[PDB]
């Protein structure tokens, strides 16, 4: 088990653990918000950057259809989030089983992730570091943990490519 | 006083003749 | 309770917006102070005692135009926070008006928009004026289009862009501006209406007999289009046709929502004295290819959908007797998969002429909004002008130095090129 | 006794029934403020069919005014004979179906149809037992064909044995207003063919042809068209309000004109119809009445009866006449126009008399007739539907509202075998 | 004869009780000065039920206005029909409960309730045989819900077999005001089930709904809402003050609707209720009265009766109507809507007729119905009660003056068993 | 009957008290001599025949501001020992204002407090206005609060504190006076209201369009806040929410009594001219974080309680509709354990407009006092300012040479950090 795919394994389990009602309202928070000015700038990038790599389709969609599928647990979006990270959601109680890329979608991810303002990049740096220190706002953590899955997926995919 | 001033339902509870 | 919010961005959005709000206040009878000496609420909000304020926002990134409105006559008509000014010119620059200096004014404008549209439920749509040639017209105007998409997803969005016409362009770098604008207004507006400057200049010359017009002369004619457009929401008619009807009847597939405009009659007092303005006559001049106000000859294209806003003393017998004439005439052609191909509406109120204007009193008029596959070539001339400059990195440092890097130019290339192929495959 | 709760959907429906209650109130001698005038007992012994007592002596119509946009209901209320309707029978929407059958039927007519079933059950259960419902709406619109036919379906499972009768305006061949005509028309005809008992078919282009060729009216408005339809709507219900030598209730029209339960599509005519300058020049008796109603220029549909065969026809005469010339003037057109009538049904044709004529005329007649000639009107809306469906046009407005392409496809298959069972009878 | 002693608890009960004493005063022809006008026998034939002679000819109400603040006392007195009350019947409070059930029931309600019971027994023993008391208050406050129910307990132990009728204005599901609603409500109801014969729930947002959709008001004030309640409770006591073909008192009503002493909470509806344009357009008859009464929009309570079973019911009609039509309409609403009525009681409802209608109505009706569909109120204030109680929220404004946690625990335990008793009878 | 005893300690207390009593004299209609040209018994006594004197003490160690009060316009309006002066200032020291020079003026202040409180039983409580960052406002504030607690225990002691606003302080030693102030008022103040300069400055910036307000422009705003709260005590209304009703409905736990304020609309002549100030629109604008009066953001805070006082021609139905619309409006979130979170009150008499001031004629106005868990941020950043203060003994030699030893700073840190984790555990 490679560490790159293990980071994918750990990242998904955070978003699956987060409550469906809380992550519903929190994801809608950062889209309709105005305060600190980075906030929707991360939302438009990241919410699309989920669906771009998780559908392997370079075409974009309206944001309202993106948002609903990002949080509806039995949707196609979480379905392929599972398959990329080595999981399958199995609806019975949706217990999830730990099972063992087009060129054009790649630069769409790369170009627009490099639009995330200087805020979102370096709270992501400190958030991983303070997670370790805590072991030794609940709103803003939702996008940041969504970028756990993006960073794990994008790095692992290019590792298999090269 | 003007906390309870119903000048409309006191006449809605009688047959109006417009 | 119908209501329409009239968003204006860019200098063309403001200056066109001054003419239509002049027309709306004059038609609805309210003085420039705001008080008239009950279906005006689509454009005017009640404010205490007998007062009616417009439902609009003014947006420039400069004080040079908006502050002059506060200095002008309609200063107590418009709410002060409705007119919003930045400081520095967006400077014909999509990148600066979308990434750099627009962010400090989007938060002000959207706070006003929410505070102005949440006053009454049953909002009807967002009517938007902008110029894709200009910097804050294309850049800031694009930015509010994501804002109104994520905030009000299901709401109608009418857009009226002043596209750079082929020969007359009045600037240099708008072959870069309007390709970046059309990349992001494909997925962020519901109906786009094509308007070119020389396409209204040439109407002023052959019809108004004006050899030396100005921008405000054009903005009277654009204001006449909008007034007959939202005429049914304000006045009772025989066949009311709201702006929800435009999307259900003129856009058959969500990408191809661009559509042209026309108006007839455009006559001054020296020819309404002699013309009989029959319903069949004014609709044939509306269908006349030289009468387009989008600079696009429809004879080298195929009509796809059609919409006519009759306005005045128009009996429904004559609209049917005239639409049969345009069906049988061969030089106009429709697409083979839209046999039923017309939408018509009649409002009882005659058009209103502004005193001092170059138009004349007309007892009936036709607004003319039609979708056709002929709009491919106006994107094609746009593609050739952009490809000429982009072959050797011209004016690119003025876009890449302000936050966006290389790649949005190529995405705008691929999205517009895909729009050409989409127009072609529909038209077969 | 008998009672017809009128139900009125769509902008066209409300304007065509503002004039329906105009001529019914005139025929019964009713002031716009509900007071009776005209000192004759023969209007008021059966006023419960279309009106109700309102403990103040005025008569409220049993009309369910229904729309999704507040505009045209403000127009009918402000018009003459407009305050006659009670205010709570108006049911309003705030957004309005934008000529979209999908959103009218499914996503925004559903929260309003709950109030509509409330207001129609207000007046159905108020009486002891009614006869049926009549619904006037469009099939080219959104609020009429989308949400009004949702009412047509739901009242069928709750009131199964009762007879419901629709006066629908259809898309026109030549003049095509409201560009999505066949999408709203084929989908409505699908749901209406198993949820209606009589379907009287009206066409606006036929109304313009009547107003020009027979009435010589140079400027026909929509009020002029709505007068013509409503004159036929009074003649189809004459016997339920007035006596006659041979009474016929409206159920008698259903049993006689329907040989097979899946075919109940009719063609409507009205006679006499004479130009204002030619009124005194033309004799008015039964032979001149019957020679007019069997003419395509007198018919209210875009279908020539000579191109098909009359399966079963009917006439509702009106006024003081002789039952003799009701018999053989109706029979001599059978044995002269022998080829135009179907062979495997003898004596094809119902005759009834309702002794009270409409006002201003001494006699009249209303034609309700099942004909195979309605075939080409069905073919024209069908092949325009497949014209836009083979290229996937305009379907995102429908499938984006909670629809799927299912409801288009078996609408088409349920439409072409409606074609096949008609085309097998000629 | 029989007298009913009215008590107004809290600032809500004072305003909705002053509205009662001007509509009863108008019904009996009494001027606000106490002088009679209206020269009819039946108005003064039974005036001792609500009024007492004052040896000067002016009638004084048997009403003890009582509160912890002078804020609404001087508004009642200075209002119209305000000088009718005896000034000695007022009991002022100077401290004022801070909307605490503890601060009403325990701290300053102790030294003020001895000054209310001395005038309650003064008004009770003044007549020969008292029928009972009616009390009127809200369950969201401190002085009305907390100390008003303190009076209810001690009038029970002093007058056991007298009828104790309660008009409780329950707190809101949706639009919550006076933020400690469930703390005042749950502590009141668990003390009120042991000490009340009849309880009638009234919800402000249901009165808001009635004022919006059925009556069509644009500017509703509190005096509007209070007049719905006052006109409703005038119909409950019609037969006590006026002759009728079928009489019914409060003790008559309690035998009908109480199969078991735990469940005594009722729904109240008043019919007819029509708007401005609609009042001249409806026929005022029995079948529309019972149809507009057996529906959710006319109930003065925010619980839908169709979500459960009507366990018992009653209707006090008023006017000169048929006894035939009253009883047949009771059979029709049971036979058609049989699913909404419980099966182990044949003929769940009953009726009465009071020959004197309300002034300005030919005929009216009030409805008192014990239903198991009102349990949704008890659960939705239970889950709000447990929402704050689970982590000790706002408890220090109750435990700091003499109330402990174990009778808070008894509060929900006496609250869930009420819901469980309703579950087993449904 | 009912009455309130205003206390005005500190220079902020003197100047704010000037604006509150100028407003109150203007409300009840009394001249500066105290005459008239029983709704005034809450603030004014019936002294003599036709004269009215305030129920307020002006406890301040600066003679240069309160001798200047007793020589100005209202010199005959106040009784001469309502205005109490020291000799030398505390000069932004908690220790000097509490230990050395404050003990000779509390003994004379309580002479007037008892002499005015025994006027009539029925007192609701005290309205203490002070400056936290000051020395007389905080040092004398602590000493006066504990003598008021030991003598008048059950009385509702309210506090309107001029907290040091986060980025502008007009002092250097303000974190010492502010940490020691909370150590007093957590155990003493029953209801505390967070006021600060910077949030009142920028609501004058954007709502009154005044680019430079002085302190008295702030003082009109705070005067209208206390006028809207105590209008229930003076004028009859539909829901009279008293001082006793405040402390029950806003305090879920006795330690947390720190509420923020908002007063809206606050509009000048130009923009009292274009709106309708309907209840829904003026209760949304009260709830905007921009209209907060503490520079504290409710976006990263969870609401606990929220009181709304209304004045003017306010209909209850539109209040109940609007408070439902703000509950379904989900930018502000209420805490899970407190689902119902509102205490509304309606008064019919609108606020009389100060002439020559900065606000205009408003038919209906909303005051709001709300508790939230966002108070953590206004205590955490003064914690971070104070822990680098006390790191290496800056400005400590002044305090320790004044009568208190080293160590009282430490328990002032420990109980405020206990207050921090108290606010964290509530919103879990
Ligand atoms: N029809 C019409 N077009 C106008 C008017 N004013 C400006 N334009 C057009 O707008 C285009 C340039 O954009 P502007 O609106 O002037 O400038 P902008 O949108 O404010 O953006 P900036 O240049 O950065 O300030 C020109 O091509 C003009 O043709 C007008 O009043 N009417
Ligand atoms: N809002 C407001 N705050 C004021 C005003 N005047 C002073 N302050 C506040 O008071 C603080 C300083 O304390 P002061 O009131 O000036 O002085 P003091 O209370 O008399 O006590 P000392 O500091 O010892 O002089 C400043 O930081 C301000 O925050 C005022 O007019 N309005
Ligand atoms: N006969 C008649 N037809 C009408 C009238 N108004 C509209 N129509 C027809 O209705 C069609 C427009 O659809 P419409 O009924 O307005 O849509 P709807 O409001 O959703 O039902 C047009 O083709 C008209 O021919 C009317 O008053 N009378
Ligand atoms: N129906 C009705 N309800 C009222 C009236 N006054 C107050 N209320 C309700 O009572 C609740 C507040 O209790 P309140 O009477 O003010 O407190 P109390 O003085 O301690 O009884 C609010 O939820 C109001 O909805 C009234 O006149 N009529
Ligand atoms: Mg530009
Ligand atoms: Mg100081």
Helix or strand or coil: residue F143? helix
Binding-site residues, ligand 3, Cβ < 6 A: D 10-12, 15-16, 97, 99, 138, 140-144, 169, 177-178, 204, 222, 225-226
* DSSP helix, strand, coil percent of chain F (3-state; round to 5): 40, 20, 40
D94, D100, D106, D110: CA torsion to nearest 10: 30
Q: How far is F346 from chain B (nearest CA, A)?
A: 10
| End-to-end CA gap in chain C | 43
**Structure token digits, residue B14:** 């009688």
F423 CB-side CA count, 13 A: 23
F169 CB-side CA count, 13 A: 15
- The DSSP-derived string for F39-97 is --TTTEEEETTTEEEESEEEEES-HHHHTTTTTSGGGGTS-TTTEEE-SS---S-HHII
User: How far is it, in rounded angstroms, from Cα E22 to Cα E8?
Assistant: 14
Are the beta carbons of C107 and A40 separated by less than 8 Å?
Answer: no
User: How far is it, in rounded angstroms, from Cα F333 to Cα F142?
Assistant: 35
User: How far is it, in rounded angstroms, from Cα C292 to Cα C261?
Assistant: 6
C-beta separation of E231 from E23 below 8 A: yes
Are the beta carbons of E222 and F315 separated by less than 8 Å?
Answer: no
**Structure token digits, residue D362:** 């001494």
Give the position, in ligand 2's atom list, of the atom nearest the Cα of F60: 20
Residue pairs spanning A and F at CB distance below 8 A: 11
User: How far is it, in rounded angstroms, from Cα E112 to Cα D1?
Assistant: 66
Is residue C273 less than 8 Å (CB to CB) from chain D? no
F305, β-bridge pairs? F371
Is residue A31 less than 8 Å (CB to CB) from chain C? yes
Determined by cryo-EM
Distance C368 CA to ligand 3 centre (A): 21
Residue owning tokens 């059309």 = C182
User: How far is it, in rounded angstroms, from Cα E321 to Cα E362?
Assistant: 9
Q: Which of D286, D287, D279, D266 is nearest to D422 (CA)?
A: D266
Strand order in the sheet with D310-319: D63-66, D4-9, D132-138, D163-170, D198-203, D265-271, D363-371, D310-319, D349-354
Residue owning tokens 């009124």 = D279
Q: Which of D226, D334, D214 is nearest to D279 (CA)?
A: D214
Is residue A40 less than 8 Å (CB to CB) from chain C? yes
Are the beta carbons of B14 and E231 separated by less than 8 Å?
Answer: no
E273, E274, E279, E285: CA torsion to nearest 10: -50
Distance E235 CA to ligand 3 centre (A): 50
Are the beta carbons of E79 and B10 separated by less than 8 Å?
Answer: no
User: How far is it, in rounded angstroms, from Cα F375 to Cα F298?
Assistant: 9
F abuts E (3+ Cβ pairs < 8 Å): yes
Query: With b meaning 16 or more CB within 10 Å and e meaning fewer, what string describes C65-101?
Result: bbeebeeeebebbbbebbbbbbeebbbbbbbbbbbbb
- In the DSSP assignment, the letter for residue E108 is S
Other C-beta atoms closer than 10 Å to the C-beta of C39 total 12
Query: With b meaning 16 or more CB within 10 Å and e meaning fewer, what string describes C225-244?
Result: bbbbbbbbbbbebbbbbbbb
Q: To test ligand 2's pocket by mutation, which of F162, F165, F180 has the most ligand atoms within 8 angstroms of CB?
A: F162
C-beta separation of C350 from D184 below 8 A: no
Q: Which of F202, F191, F427, F416 is nearest to F300 (CA)?
A: F427
Give the position, in ligand 3's atom list, of the atom nearest the Cα of D96: 20
* Ligand closest in space to the Cα of D71: 3
* Beta-strand relationship, E198-202 and E265-271: parallel
Are the beta carbons of D52 and E284 separated by less than 8 Å?
Answer: no
User: How far is it, in rounded angstroms, from Cα F2 to Cα F235?
Assistant: 12
Annotated resolution, angstroms: 3.3
Q: Is D15 annotated as a binding residue?
A: yes
C-beta separation of E107 from E46 below 8 A: no
User: How far is it, in rounded angstroms, from Cα B3 to Cα E74?
Assistant: 12
User: How far is it, in rounded angstroms, from Cα E241 to Cα E237?
Assistant: 7
Distance E140 CA to ligand 4 centre (A): 7
Q: Please, is F122 exposed, middle or buried when counting C-beta atoms within 10 Å of its C-beta (0-12, 13-18, 19+)?
A: middle
D82, D88, D90, D92: CA torsion to nearest 10: 140
F318 CB-side CA count, 13 A: 17
| Ligand 2 pocket member F213 (CB < 6 A) | no
| Closest alpha carbon within chain C to A111 | C407
Go through chain A and tell me how many residues it has: 162
Distance C83 CA to ligand 1 centre (A): 17
For residue F185, give the H/E element and its range.
helix F174-185
* Beta-strand relationship, F51-54 and F364-372: unpaired
User: How far is it, in rounded angstroms, from Cα D136 to Cα D76?
Assistant: 15
A9, A12, A13, A18: CA torsion to nearest 10: 170
C-beta separation of F316 from E222 below 8 A: yes
Helix or strand or coil: residue E199? strand
Query: With b meaning 16 or more CB within 10 Å and e meaning fewer, what string describes C338-374?
Result: bbbbbbbbbbebebbbeeebbbbebebbbbbbbbbbb
A16 CA to centre of own chain: 11
**Structure token digits, residue D131:** 């006869």
User: How far is it, in rounded angstroms, from Cα E275 to Cα E292?
Assistant: 14
Give the position, in ligand 3's atom list, of the atom nearest the Cα of D104: 20
Are the beta carbons of A35 and F331 separated by less than 8 Å?
Answer: no
Q: Which of D230, D225, D267 is nearest to D370 (CA)?
A: D267
Q: Which of E191, E215, E211 is nearest to E203 (CA)?
A: E211
C-beta separation of F357 from F322 below 8 A: no
For residue E169, give the H/E element and its range.
strand E163-169
Rg of chain B over Cα atoms, rounded to whole angstroms, equals 10
Cβ contacts (< 8 Å) between A62 and chain C: which residues? 149, 153, 187
Rg of chain D over Cα atoms, rounded to whole angstroms, equals 21
User: How far is it, in rounded angstroms, from Cα D293 to Cα D289?
Assistant: 7
* Beta-strand relationship, E51-52 and E60-61: antiparallel
F302 CA to centre of own chain: 22
User: How far is it, in rounded angstroms, from Cα E287 to Cα D192?
Assistant: 33
Other C-beta atoms closer than 10 Å to the C-beta of F115 total 10
User: How far is it, in rounded angstroms, from Cα C59 to Cα C76?
Assistant: 18
| Ligand 2 pocket member F218 (CB < 6 A) | yes
User: How far is it, in rounded angstroms, from Cα F201 to Cα F295?
Assistant: 10
Are the beta carbons of C115 and F275 separated by less than 8 Å?
Answer: no
Prior bond of E360 cis (ω within 30°): no
- The DSSP-derived string for F400-428 is HTTT--TTHHHHHHHHHHHHHHHHHHHT-
Helix or strand or coil: residue F194? strand
Distance C129 CA to ligand 5 centre (A): 15
Spot the catalytic one: F245, F281, F288, F408: F245
Q: What are φ and ψ of residue F414, in 5° steps?
A: -75, -40
User: How far is it, in rounded angstroms, from Cα C89 to Cα C64?
Assistant: 9
* Beta-strand relationship, D132-138 and D163-170: parallel
Q: What are φ and ψ of residue C25, in 5° steps?
A: -70, -35
Q: Which of F162, F282, F268 is nearest to F218 (CA)?
A: F162
User: How far is it, in rounded angstroms, from Cα E25 to Cα E120?
Assistant: 21
Show Cβ contacts of residue D111 under 8 Å, excluding neighbours closer than 6 positions. none
Q: Which of E303, E126, E294 is nearest to E206 (CA)?
A: E303
C395 CB-side CA count, 13 A: 18
Show Cβ contacts of residue F59 under 8 Å, excluding neighbours closer than 6 positions. F7, F8, F9, F13, F84, F105, F109, F136, F140, F144
User: How far is it, in rounded angstroms, from Cα E360 to Cα E231?
Assistant: 12
- The DSSP-derived string for D239-269 is TTTS--SB---HHHHHHHH-SSTT--EEEEE
Q: Whose CA is nearest to atom 5 of ligand 2?
A: F12
Cβ contacts (< 8 Å) between B3 and chain F: which residues? 236, 238
Q: Which of E126, E137, E197 is nearest to E6 (CA)?
A: E137
Helix or strand or coil: residue C145? helix
Q: How far is D408 from chain C (nearest CA, A)?
A: 17
Residue owning tokens 């995405």 = C411
C-beta separation of F142 from F186 below 8 A: no
Q: How far is E79 from chain F (nearest CA, A)?
A: 13
Q: To test ligand 2's pocket by mutation, which of F8, F9, F12 has the most ligand atoms within 8 angstroms of CB?
A: F12
Active-site positions of C read 245
C-beta separation of F113 from F5 below 8 A: yes
- In the DSSP assignment, the letter for residue A101 is -
* Ligand closest in space to the Cα of F194: 2
C-beta separation of F267 from F207 below 8 A: yes
C-beta separation of E37 from E163 below 8 A: no
The C-alpha angle D294, D300, D305, rounded to 5 degrees, equals 45
User: How far is it, in rounded angstroms, from Cα F159 to Cα F252?
Assistant: 18
Dmax of chain C from CA atoms?
62
Are the beta carbons of F300 and A139 separated by less than 8 Å?
Answer: yes
Residue owning tokens 């007062």 = C51
Other C-beta atoms closer than 10 Å to the C-beta of E402 total 12
**Structure token digits, residue E44:** 């003064």
Residue owning tokens 């025929």 = D27
Are the beta carbons of F337 and E182 separated by less than 8 Å?
Answer: no
- The H helix count followed by the E strand count for chain E is 18, 11
Helix or strand or coil: residue C296? coil
User: How far is it, in rounded angstroms, from Cα C100 to Cα C402?
Assistant: 7
Binding-site residues, ligand 1, Cβ < 6 A: C 10-12, 15-16, 60, 89-92, 131, 133-137, 162, 170-171, 197, 215, 218-219
A abuts C (3+ Cβ pairs < 8 Å): yes
C-beta separation of C58 from C36 below 8 A: no
Residue owning tokens 């010492």 = F176
C-beta separation of D327 from D363 below 8 A: no
Is residue C122 less than 8 Å (CB to CB) from chain A? no
Q: Is the dihedral of CA D127, D131, D136, D139 positive or negative?
A: positive
User: How far is it, in rounded angstroms, from Cα C264 to Cα C366?
Assistant: 6
Angle at which helices F243-250 and F215-234 cross, to 10°: 100
Give the position, in ligand 2's atom list, of the atom nearest the Cα of F177: 23
Q: What are φ and ψ of residue E246, in 5° steps?
A: -145, 105
Query: With b meaning 16 or more CB within 10 Å and e meaning fewer, what string describes C120-149?
Result: eeebbbbbbbbbbbbbbbbbbbbbbbbbbb
| Closest alpha carbon within chain E to D59 | E281
Prior bond of E425 cis (ω within 30°): no
* Ligand closest in space to the Cα of C293: 1
Distance A62 CA to ligand 1 centre (A): 29
Residue owning tokens 């599972």 = A82
- The DSSP-derived string for E299-353 is BSSSS-GGGS-EEEEEEEEEES--HHHHHHHHHHHHHTT-TTB-SSSSS---EEE
Other C-beta atoms closer than 10 Å to the C-beta of C270 total 9
Q: Is C62 annotated as a binding residue?
A: yes
């Amino acid at each position: 088990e490679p560490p790159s795919f293990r980071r994918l394994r750990h990242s998904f389990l955070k978003l699956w653990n987060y409550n469906e009602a809380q992550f519903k309202a929190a994801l809608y928070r950062h889209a309709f918000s105005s305060f600190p000015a980075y906030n929707y700038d991360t939302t438009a990038i990241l919410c699309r950057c989920i669906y771009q790599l998780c559908a392997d389709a370079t075409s974009a969609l309206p944001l309202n259809s993106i948002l609903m599928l990002l949080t509806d647990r039995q949707s196609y979006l979480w379905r392929r989030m599972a398959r990329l990270s080595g999981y399958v959601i199995c609806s019975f109680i949706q217990r999830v089983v730990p099972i063992p890329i087009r060129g054009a979608v790649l630069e769409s991810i790369e170009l627009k992730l490099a639009k995330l303002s200087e805020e979102f990049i370096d709270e992501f740096v400190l958030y991983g570091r303070q997670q370790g220190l805590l072991l030794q706002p609940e709103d803003r953590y939702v996008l940041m943990d969504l970028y756990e899955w993006l960073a794990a997926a994008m790095t692992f995919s290019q590792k298999c490519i090269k | 006083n003007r906390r309870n001033w119903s000048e409309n339902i006191e006449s809605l509870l009688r047959q109006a003749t417009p | 309770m119908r209501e329409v919010i009239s968003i204006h961005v860019g200098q063309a959005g403001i200056q066109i917006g001054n003419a239509c709000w002049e027309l709306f206040c004059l038609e609805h009878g309210i003085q420039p102070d705001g008080q008239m000496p009950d279906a005006f609420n689509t454009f005017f909000s009640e404010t205490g005692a007998g007062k009616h304020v417009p439902r609009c926002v003014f947006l420039d990134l400069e004080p040079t135009v908006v502050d002059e409105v506060r200095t002008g006559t309609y200063r107590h008509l418009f709410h002060p926070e409705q007119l919003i000014s930045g400081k520095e010119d967006a400077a014909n620059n999509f990148a600066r008006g979308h990434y750099t200096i627009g962010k400090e004014i989007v938060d002000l404008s959207l706070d006003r928009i929410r505070k102005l549209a949440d006053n009454c439920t049953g909002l009807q749509g967002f009517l938007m004026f902008n110029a894709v040639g200009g910097g804050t017209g294309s850049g800031l105007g694009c930015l509010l289009l994501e804002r109104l998409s994520v905030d009000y997803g299901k709401k109608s969005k009418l857009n009226f862009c002043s596209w750079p016409s082929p020969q007359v362009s009045t600037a240099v770098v708008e072959p870069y501006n309007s390709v970046l604008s059309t990349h992001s207004l494909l997925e962020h507006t519901d109906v786009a209406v094509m308007l070119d400057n020389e396409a209204i200049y040439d109407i002023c010359r052959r019809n108004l007999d004006i050899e030396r017009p100005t921008y405000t002369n054009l903005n009277r004619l654009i204001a006449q289009v909008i007034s007959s457009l939202t005429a049914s929401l304000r006045f009772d008619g025989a066949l009311n046709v709201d702006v929800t009807e435009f999307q259900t009847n003129l856009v058959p597939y969500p990408r191809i929502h661009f559509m042209l405009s026309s108006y007839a009659p455009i006559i001054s007092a020296e020819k309404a004295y002699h013309e009989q303005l029959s319903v069949a006559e004014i609709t044939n001049s509306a269908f006349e290819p030289a009468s387009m106000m989008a600079k696009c000859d429809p004879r080298h294209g195929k009509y796809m959908a059609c919409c006519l806003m009759y306005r005045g003393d128009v009996v429904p017998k004559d609209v049917n007797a005239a639409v049969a004439t345009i069906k049988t005439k061969r030089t106009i052609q429709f697409v083979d998969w839209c046999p039923t191909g017309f939408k018509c509406g009649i409002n009882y109120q005659p058009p209103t002429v502004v005193p001092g204007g170059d138009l004349a009193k007309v007892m009936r008029a036709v607004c003319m909004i039609s979708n056709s596959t002929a709009i491919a070539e106006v994107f094609s001339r746009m593609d050739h002008k952009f490809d000429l400059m982009y072959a050797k990195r011209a004016f690119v440092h003025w876009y890449v130095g302000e936050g966006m890097e290389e790649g949005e130019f190529s995405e705008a290339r691929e999205d517009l090129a895909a729009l050409e192929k989409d127009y072609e495959e529909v038209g077969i | 006794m008998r009672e017809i709760v009128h139900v009125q959907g769509g902008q066209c429906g409300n304007q065509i029934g503002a004039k329906f209650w105009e001529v019914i109130s005139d025929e019964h001698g009713i002031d716009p403020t509900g007071t009776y005038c005209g000192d004759s007992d023969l209007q008021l012994e059966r006023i419960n069919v279309f009106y109700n007592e309102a403990t103040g002596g005025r008569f409220v119509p049993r009309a369910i005014l229904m729309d999704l946009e507040p505009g045209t209901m403000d127009s009918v209320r402000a018009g003459p004979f407009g305050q006659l309707f009670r205010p709570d029978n108006f049911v309003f929407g705030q957004t309005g179906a934008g000529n979209n059958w999908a959103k009218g039927h499914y996503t925004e007519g559903a929260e309003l149809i709950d109030s509509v079933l409330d207001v129609v059950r207000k007046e159905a259960e108020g009486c002891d037992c009614l006869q049926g419902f009549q619904i006037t709406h469009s099939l080219g619109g959104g609020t009429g064909s989308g949400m009004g036919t949702l009412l047509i379906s739901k009242v069928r499972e709750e009131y199964p044995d009762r007879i419901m009768e629709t006066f629908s305006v259809f898309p026109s061949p030549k003049v095509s207003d409201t560009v999505v005509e066949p999408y709203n028309a084929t989908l409505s005809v699908h749901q209406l063919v198993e949820n209606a008992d009589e379907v009287q078919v009206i066409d606006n282009e036929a109304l313009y042809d009547i107003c020009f060729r027979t009435l010589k009216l140079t400027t026909p408005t929509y009020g002029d068209l709505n007068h013509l339809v409503s004159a036929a709507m009074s003649g189809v219900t004459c016997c339920l309000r007035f006596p006659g030598q041979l009474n016929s209730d409206l159920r008698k029209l259903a049993v006689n004109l329907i040989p097979f339960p899946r075919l109940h599509f009719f063609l409507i005519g009205f006679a006499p119809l004479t130009s204002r300058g030619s009124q005194q020049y033309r004799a008015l008796s039964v032979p001149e009445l019957t020679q007019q109603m069997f003419d395509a220029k007198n018919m209210m549909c875009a279908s020539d009866p000579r191109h098909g065969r009359y399966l079963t026809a009917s006439a509702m005469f009106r006024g003081r006449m002789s039952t003799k010339e009701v018999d053989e003037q109706m029979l001599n057109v059978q044995n002269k126009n022998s080829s135009y009538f179907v062979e495997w049904i003898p004596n094809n044709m119902k005759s009834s008399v309702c002794d009270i004529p409409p006002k201003g005329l001494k006699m009249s007649v209303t034609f309700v007739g099942n004909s195979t000639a309605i075939q080409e009107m069905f073919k024209r809306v069908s092949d325009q539907f497949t014209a836009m469906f083979r290229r996937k046009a305009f379907l995102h407005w429908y499938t984006g509202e909670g629809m799927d392409e299912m409801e288009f496809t078996e609408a088409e298959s349920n439409m072409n075998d409606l074609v096949s069972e008609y085309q097998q009878y000629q």
